[PDB]
Amino acid sequence: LIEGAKRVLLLHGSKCPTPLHTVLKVFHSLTTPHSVLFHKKNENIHPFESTESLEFLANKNDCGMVIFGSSNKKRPNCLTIARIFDSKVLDMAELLLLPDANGEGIPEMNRLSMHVAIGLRPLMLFSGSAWDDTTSTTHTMLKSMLVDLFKGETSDKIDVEGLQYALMVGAEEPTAGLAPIIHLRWYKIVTKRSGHKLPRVELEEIGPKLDFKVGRIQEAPRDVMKEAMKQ
């Protein structure tokens, strides 16, 4: 049994900071049609306390991933990513959104770009040494999660005209005493005549510019992950 696209629940409460809400709207757009955006109007969940409500909402919506936006004093502008296997949380990670240098903030938007069709698979680029470090449990998890999230409905064919945009996930080179920082950036792919058969690529920045510090990590139990990884 070959699973189709992993369905994604995008979740927030009423007091979710607007920039985080923008991120969820963009993520909902990027994962359309295999995603659901839900404004939970009662009160706030806390997955690292208890994953009960997160599991209940994920199962109710038949979603294998949950992206949850929340913010309080200790963990401001937090994006929590969870995966679901066999109706229970598998692994979870917190990503703490960092300020941009200029202090601009994320512009309001509902989709990645008016020049990128909703639902297209992205080209993906993981840059930085940490993704190639099999001892970094955090980068191993995050790479797995982000490919799982944005791979869409994989297929063995793709229209050349569909090769329109890219996601880069840049892992800042690790420093001994600091939580890892990762950068997500999307780009429109511009191709121009190079003189060669292959086109020259140039990029245009599109969508939200996201910088994250990694927060808490909840590993999957070894035995459960081994079960979920059976193909």
Binding site: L125, K157, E173
Partner: protein
């Protein structure tokens, strides 16, 4: 007259079934440059490399319905949502 090859000290690797490239070279973020510019330069090298790889190593099929690439099976193994039957 526009270079389309990408030279880095360590080779890219690929998972073209996921339209994916890995740049294992250290992420270069010189302090004197804006973060976004630094990131964009690395992205451009990587997307160039990825597109080069897609166009040169995947069979290309043209028909009256358009032009498509055949992708190899994804090599990155990801966990299931539901158990096997």
């Amino acid at each position: 007259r526009l270079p389309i090859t990408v030279s880095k000290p360590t080779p890219y690797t690929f998972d073209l079934g996921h339209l994916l490239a890995n740049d294992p070279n250290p992420l270069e973020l010189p302090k004197s440059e804006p973060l976004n510019a630094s990131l964009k330069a690395t992205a451009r090298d990587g997307v160039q490399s990825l597109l080069n790889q897609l166009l040169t190593t995947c069979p290309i099929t043209s028909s009256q319905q358009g032009v498509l690439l055949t992708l190899p099976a994804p090599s990155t193994i990801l966990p299931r949502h539901k158990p096997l039957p």
